[PDB]
């Protein structure tokens, strides 16, 4: 594994997010707001080689999108709705992977609170895992044409980033 620690990039973080001092936690500062306004942030590293693994703790969030993007994705447009963004997304009961405004359903075990992100840049893959259940969720087969940056987007609650990780045994 090539995995290195990274944190959120303050220049790429939505101004309405509360960020921890280590740059690893982001939080939005029975009727709910359905407004599609997302709160996105990008990591402070770009990758164009090697094999990288990180995890995200989603806790109680019910609406989030986690993945990678080229620099060409516009700021705060990291939810798979352009050709520069690849995400795993939850919205309440719906789990998808999304890229270029095209989705595929993902069947996810109940009560997902942690996501694993495996970027095998050299072998043209981005894979999502359920680490609690030690299992594969989805692989994009993609030959990246620019460097990629981790991205993290919420509509509610908070995320925590676990970076610099040894590939768990289920890789």
UniProtKB/Swiss-Prot annotation:
The B30.2/SPRY domain, residue ranges: 2-170
Domain of life, source organism: Eukaryota
Tissue specificity field: Low level in fetal kidney and lung, and in adult prostate, ovary and small intestine.
Modification after translation, per record: Phosphorylated on serine and threonine residues.
Cleavable signal peptide: none
Localization in the cell: Cytoplasm; Cytoplasm, Cytoskeleton
Family: Belongs to the TRIM/RBCC family.
Disease as annotated in the protein's UniProt record: Intellectual developmental disorder, X-linked 101: A disorder characterized by significantly below average general intellectual functioning associated with impairments in adaptive behavior and manifested during the developmental period. Intellectual deficiency is the only primary symptom of non-syndromic X-linked forms, while syndromic forms present with associated physical, neurological and/or psychiatric manifestations. XLID101 clinical features include global developmental delay, hyperactivity often with aggressive outbursts, and seizures in some patients.
Domain notes: The tripartite motif (RBCC; RING- and B box-type zinc fingers and coiled coil domains) mediates dimerization.
Function of the protein: E3 ubiquitin ligase that plays a role in microtubule stabilization. Mediates the 'Lys-48'-linked polyubiquitination of LRRK2 to drive its localization to microtubules and its proteasomal degradation in neurons. This ubiquitination inhibits LRRK2 kinase activation by RAB29.
Assembly notes: Homodimer or heterodimer with MID1. Interacts with IGBP1.
Name of protein: Probable E3 ubiquitin-protein ligase MID2
Organism name: Homo sapiens (Human)
Gene that encodes the chain: MID2
């Amino acid at each position: 594994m090539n995995s290195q620690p990274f944190k959120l990039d303050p220049k790429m973080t939505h101004k309405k997010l509360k960020i921890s001092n280590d740059g690893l936690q982001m939080e939005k500062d029975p009727e709910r707001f359905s407004g599609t306004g997302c709160y996105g942030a990008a990591g402070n590293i770009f990758i164009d080689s090697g094999c990288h693994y990180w995890e995200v703790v989603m806790g109680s969030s019910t609406w989030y999108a986690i993945g990678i993007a080229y620099k060409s994705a516009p700021k705060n447009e990291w939810i798979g709705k352009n050709a520069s963004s690849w995400v795993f997304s939850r919205c309440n009961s719906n789990f998808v992977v999304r890229h270029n405004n095209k989705e595929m359903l993902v069947d996810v075990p109940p009560h997902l609170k942690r996501l694993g992100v495996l970027l095998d840049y050299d072998n043209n893959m981005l894979s999502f895992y359920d680490p609690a259940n030690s299992l594969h969720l989805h692989t994009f087969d993609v030959t990246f044409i620019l460097p990629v940056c981790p991205t993290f987007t919420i509509w509610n609650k908070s995320l925590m980033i676990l970076s610099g990780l040894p590939a768990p045994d289920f890789i």
